[PDB]
């Protein structure tokens, strides 16, 4: 099959790619190289490694499963790339669905909507977050810098009226203190959530409305959450997969089941700004580094890695700059 299940780095330094042939490779962006290559851990052809999240540019990796079911739901390994050794092997009562890390806090998401929060210096579990224990799946996002701030989608107070709903809750994982609870921002389910690297901004994706809403995260008035802006969907409602926020929080990238990748600007310092054409039935992942605000990195399951430029004052499409091919 195709080289599926791409994973993208917080600092846009490198990306995670599950080659369907053998193991999982991690490439670099500048200069482009085979950064890390996991060995054979397979027994059949279409069984896939699912979840890899990494640190910024380091040797520390979070790896989850290899086998379809032998040791997948209840596993988490911490490996050094330069020596290929497993350090700590944590076990969990349910199936992992996502893992997000930063420089201070590791989060592990379960299928049963449980979120495990760890101080990464000693792996002490700070708090267990029973989301489904209170009231598609839960989408979680986290700030990259310190003062790491956690954002998750929670059900509303209409569980009696119907089974599925989605509101937003802002959580400080540093002190384990809930900051702000946002109401039902959508008349539908929440498909993907992105939080700014400095933790001040937050995006929300609906399945039915397909209109991205941006709220202030922490500094927002206690009385009511503050809505920042809204973005035009386009000509057709489309499911969104992954969104990202620029380091100066001026730019927002959006990808999904669509022909195009949209770029939204921010009024912090409207409908559409920069659009990148994309092959139809092929899936891609986004990123942009800290070095410049004009470069957007693009990861593709077709085997191509592209670097596009952004037009500051023109509503035109992006301009391709650098490209290389996968393995």
């Amino acid at each position: 099959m195709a080289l599926k299940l791409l994973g993208f780095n917080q600092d846009a330094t490198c990306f995670s790619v599950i080659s369907s042939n053998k193991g999982v490779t991690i490439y670099n962006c500048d200069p482009f190289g085979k950064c890390f290559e996991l060995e054979k851990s397979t027994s059949n052809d279409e069984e896939l490694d699912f979840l890899v999240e990494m640190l910024f540019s380091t040797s520390l990796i979070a790896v989850v499963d290899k086998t379809i079911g032998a040791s997948k739901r209840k596993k988490l390994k911490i490996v050094n790339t330069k020596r290929k050794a497993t350090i700590c092997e944590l076990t969990f009562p349910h199936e992992i669905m996502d893992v997000i890390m930063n420089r201070k806090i590791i989060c592990v998401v379960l299928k049963s909507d449980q979120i495990f929060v760890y101080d990464i210096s000693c792996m002490k579990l700070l708090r267990t977050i029973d989301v489904r224990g209170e009231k598609i799946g839960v989408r979680v996002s986290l700030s990259t810098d310190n003062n790491s701030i956690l954002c998750y989608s929670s059900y509303s107070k209409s569980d009696k009226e119907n089974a599925p709903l989605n509101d937003i809750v802002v959580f400080d994982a540093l002190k384990c203190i809930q900051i702000n609870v946002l109401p039902a921002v959508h008349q539908s389910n929440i498909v993907c959530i992105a939080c700014s690297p400095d933790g001040m901004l937050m995006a929300t994706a609906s399945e039915k409305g397909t209109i991205i809403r941006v709220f202030k995260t922490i500094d927002t008035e206690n009385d009511e959450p503050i809505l920042v802006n809204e973005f035009r969907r386009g000509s057709r409602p489309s499911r969104i997969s992954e969104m990202k926020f620029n380091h100066d929080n001026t730019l927002l990238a959006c990808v999904g089941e669509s022909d195009t990748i949209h770029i939204f600007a921010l009024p912090v310092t409207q409908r559409h700004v920069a659009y990148i054409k994309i092959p139809e039935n092929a899936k891609y992942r986004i990123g942009f580094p800290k070095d410049t605000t004009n470069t957007i990195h693009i990861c593709g399951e077709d085997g191509n890695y592209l670097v596009y430029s952004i037009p500051r004052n023109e509503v035109g499409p992006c301009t391709l700059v650098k490209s290389n091919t996968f393995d």
Binding site: F56, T58, L60, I87, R103, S121, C122, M123, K290, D291
Partner: protein, 35 residues
């Protein structure tokens, strides 16, 4: 400067690995003394 910021990040990662291995040595040692 950029490279320095990147370097500090590997250092923070290696100290976690050093903080994690020392905690596996204490976990292992207690078990060895018992049996």
């Amino acid at each position: 400067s950029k490279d320095a910021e990147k370097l500090n990040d590997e250092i923070i990662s290696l100290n976690i690995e050093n903080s994690l291995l020392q905690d596996k040595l204490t976990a292992l040692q207690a078990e060895y003394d018992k049996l």
